Design an enzyme around this catalytic site. Structure first.
Site, PDB file in Angstrom:
ATOM      1  N   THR A   5      -5.846   5.926   8.985  1.00  0.00           N
ATOM      2  CA  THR A   5      -6.466   6.232   7.730  1.00  0.00           C
ATOM      3  C   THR A   5      -6.439   5.047   6.748  1.00  0.00           C
ATOM      4  O   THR A   5      -6.871   5.203   5.579  1.00  0.00           O
ATOM      5  CB  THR A   5      -5.764   7.391   7.042  1.00  0.00           C
ATOM      6  OG1 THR A   5      -4.455   7.000   6.657  1.00  0.00           O
ATOM      7  CG2 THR A   5      -5.807   8.668   7.940  1.00  0.00           C
ATOM      8  N   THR A   6      -5.889   3.916   7.193  1.00  0.00           N
ATOM      9  CA  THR A   6      -6.026   2.661   6.427  1.00  0.00           C
ATOM     10  C   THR A   6      -6.715   1.625   7.296  1.00  0.00           C
ATOM     11  O   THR A   6      -6.632   1.664   8.530  1.00  0.00           O
ATOM     12  CB  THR A   6      -4.668   2.058   6.067  1.00  0.00           C
ATOM     13  OG1 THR A   6      -3.875   1.921   7.260  1.00  0.00           O
ATOM     14  CG2 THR A   6      -3.919   2.993   5.036  1.00  0.00           C
ATOM     15  N   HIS A  66       5.656   6.597   6.956  1.00  0.00           N
ATOM     16  CA  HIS A  66       5.352   6.211   5.581  1.00  0.00           C
ATOM     17  C   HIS A  66       4.714   7.458   5.021  1.00  0.00           C
ATOM     18  O   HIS A  66       4.503   8.430   5.772  1.00  0.00           O
ATOM     19  CB  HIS A  66       4.325   5.043   5.553  1.00  0.00           C
ATOM     20  CG  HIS A  66       3.023   5.370   6.290  1.00  0.00           C
ATOM     21  ND1 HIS A  66       2.857   5.142   7.634  1.00  0.00           N
ATOM     22  CD2 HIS A  66       1.869   6.021   5.863  1.00  0.00           C
ATOM     23  CE1 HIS A  66       1.627   5.583   8.007  1.00  0.00           C
ATOM     24  NE2 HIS A  66       1.037   6.134   6.930  1.00  0.00           N
ATOM     25  N   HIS A  81       0.814  -1.193   0.000  1.00  0.00           N
ATOM     26  CA  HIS A  81       0.000   0.000   0.000  1.00  0.00           C
ATOM     27  C   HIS A  81       0.856   1.253   0.000  1.00  0.00           C
ATOM     28  O   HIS A  81       0.542   2.221  -0.730  1.00  0.00           O
ATOM     29  CB  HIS A  81      -0.974  -0.060   1.151  1.00  0.00           C
ATOM     30  CG  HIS A  81      -1.880  -1.298   1.120  1.00  0.00           C
ATOM     31  ND1 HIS A  81      -2.927  -1.422   0.272  1.00  0.00           N
ATOM     32  CD2 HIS A  81      -1.844  -2.471   1.867  1.00  0.00           C
ATOM     33  CE1 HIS A  81      -3.552  -2.598   0.501  1.00  0.00           C
ATOM     34  NE2 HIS A  81      -2.882  -3.238   1.474  1.00  0.00           N
TER      35      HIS A  81
HETATM   36  N1  LIG Z   1      -2.124   6.263   7.620  1.00  0.00           N
HETATM   37  S1  LIG Z   1      -1.928   6.129   9.347  1.00  0.00           S
HETATM   38  O1  LIG Z   1      -0.800   7.106   9.826  1.00  0.00           O
HETATM   39  O2  LIG Z   1      -3.208   6.511  10.041  1.00  0.00           O
HETATM   40  C1  LIG Z   1      -1.226   4.485   9.653  1.00  0.00           C
HETATM   41  C2  LIG Z   1      -0.900   4.220  10.970  1.00  0.00           C
HETATM   42  F1  LIG Z   1      -1.178   5.127  11.935  1.00  0.00           F
HETATM   43  C3  LIG Z   1      -0.334   3.012  11.319  1.00  0.00           C
HETATM   44  F2  LIG Z   1      -0.080   2.850  12.647  1.00  0.00           F
HETATM   45  C4  LIG Z   1      -0.005   2.051  10.373  1.00  0.00           C
HETATM   46  S2  LIG Z   1       0.736   0.549  11.108  1.00  0.00           S
HETATM   47  O3  LIG Z   1      -0.288   0.096  12.189  1.00  0.00           O
HETATM   48  O4  LIG Z   1       0.429  -0.692  10.197  1.00  0.00           O
HETATM   49  C5  LIG Z   1       2.453   0.293  11.766  1.00  0.00           C
HETATM   50  C6  LIG Z   1       2.764  -1.198  12.028  1.00  0.00           C
HETATM   51  O5  LIG Z   1       4.140  -1.500  12.013  1.00  0.00           O
HETATM   52  C7  LIG Z   1      -0.277   2.284   8.984  1.00  0.00           C
HETATM   53  N2  LIG Z   1      -0.003   1.256   8.007  1.00  0.00           N
HETATM   54  C8  LIG Z   1       1.035   0.226   8.021  1.00  0.00           C
HETATM   55  C9  LIG Z   1       0.576  -1.017   7.339  1.00  0.00           C
HETATM   56  C10 LIG Z   1       1.447  -2.098   7.164  1.00  0.00           C
HETATM   57  C11 LIG Z   1       1.002  -3.259   6.522  1.00  0.00           C
HETATM   58  C12 LIG Z   1      -0.315  -3.340   6.055  1.00  0.00           C
HETATM   59  C13 LIG Z   1      -1.185  -2.260   6.230  1.00  0.00           C
HETATM   60  C14 LIG Z   1      -0.740  -1.100   6.871  1.00  0.00           C
HETATM   61  C15 LIG Z   1      -0.918   3.513   8.653  1.00  0.00           C
HETATM   62  F3  LIG Z   1      -1.242   3.751   7.351  1.00  0.00           F
HETATM   63 ZN   LIG Z   2      -0.648   7.211   6.815  1.00  0.00          ZN
END
Ligand SMILES: NS(=O)(=O)c1c(F)c(F)c(S(=O)(=O)CCO)c(NCc2ccccc2)c1F
Ligand SMILES: [Zn+2]
Length: 257
Positions: A195-196, A91, A61
């Site tokens: 947001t995912t 990211h 993603h």
């Molecule tokens: N867009 S966001 O800042 O709200 C967010 C997070 F806050 C977040 F904590 C994550 S996380 O939980 O997965 C970090 C785990 O190490 C992701 N996305 C990461 C991700 C990884 C694999 C599959 C889907 C999402 C993520 F996208």
């Molecule tokens: Zn994000």
């Protein structure tokens, strides 16, 4: 199954993750005029001196840069927060075009991309437990506009061709995330969500007012990544952002003006 296309994009997520239509979803449009100044909000404390980056990964993603979060090495505190949040990864979300890409918007303006530095509340002991709590995460969001290069981003851009497709990863040590910060730490803050998917409502959002600038060549390199795995047909990793969601019964607070 979920992703960012016509058939599995944000408008479909609610079918697997009903919290998509929940009371505190992110991102949101930041209406700069009705954000409430709060003179009791503290300066944000960004302590990233001892940060230990480990690795960079294409998860299909976006790409994550992951950090060692087994000790207090890179932490966010102060601002609207109580206690210590440890940096686990950052990211980006970005567009197919320089005119879109950010998840939060500011008076409806989209930015070319948005950086998320994801931190978890150390009183919950790890990230998996933190996401299950309404104050479990603090995510610091930084907008990117296209203009001058951001030299502190170049080490990231230069490794991307080693993690082109879904599932690839690479060693990524000694990356200093302080090189991604703008000059000012003035911020807006509100309670929201990942947001995912799983879209958990566990995030205190801290969105910096000042965008960083990155060059057109830097952002072009993000757009050469792939959502697909090495085996499969090429789908460019672009437009991996969720649009603004209803603010509902929330007030965005500002640390400034
Ligand atoms: N867009 S966001 O800042 O709200 C967010 C997070 F806050 C977040 F904590 C994550 S996380 O939980 O997965 C970090 C785990 O190490 C992701 N996305 C990461 C991700 C990884 C694999 C599959 C889907 C999402 C993520 F996208
Ligand atoms: Zn994000």
């Amino acid at each position: 199954h979920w992703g960012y296309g016509k058939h599995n994009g944000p408008e479909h997520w609610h079918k697997d993750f009903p919290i998509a239509k929940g009371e505190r979803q992110s991102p949101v449009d930041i209406d700069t005029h009705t954000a409430k100044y709060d003179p009791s909000l503290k300066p944000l404390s960004v302590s990233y001196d001892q940060a230990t980056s480990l690795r960079i990964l294409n998860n299909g993603h976006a790409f994550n840069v992951e950090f060692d979060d087994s000790q207090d090495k890179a932490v966010l505190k102060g601002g609207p927060l109580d206690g210590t949040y440890r940096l686990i990864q950052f990211h980006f979300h970005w567009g197919s075009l320089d005119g879109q890409g950010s998840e939060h918007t500011v008076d409806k303006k989209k930015y070319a991309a948005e950086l998320h530095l994801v931190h978890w509340n150390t009183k919950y002991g790890d990230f998996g437990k933190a996401v299950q709590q309404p104050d479990g995460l603090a995510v610091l969001g930084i907008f990117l506009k296209v203009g001058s290069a951001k030299p502190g981003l170049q080490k990231v851009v230069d490794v991307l061709d080693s993690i082109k497709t879904k599932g690839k990863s690479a060693d990524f040590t000694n990356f200093d995330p302080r090189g991604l910060l703008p000059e000012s730490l003035d911020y807006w803050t509100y309670p929201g969500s990942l947001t995912t998917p799983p879209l958990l409502e566990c995030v205190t959002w801290i969105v910096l007012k000042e965008p960083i600038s990155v060059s057109s060549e830097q952002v072009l390199k993000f757009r050469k990544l792939n959502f697909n795995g090495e085996g499969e047909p090429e789908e460019l990793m672009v437009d991996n952002w969720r649009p603004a969601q209803p603010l509902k019964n929330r007030q965005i607070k500002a640390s400034f003006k």
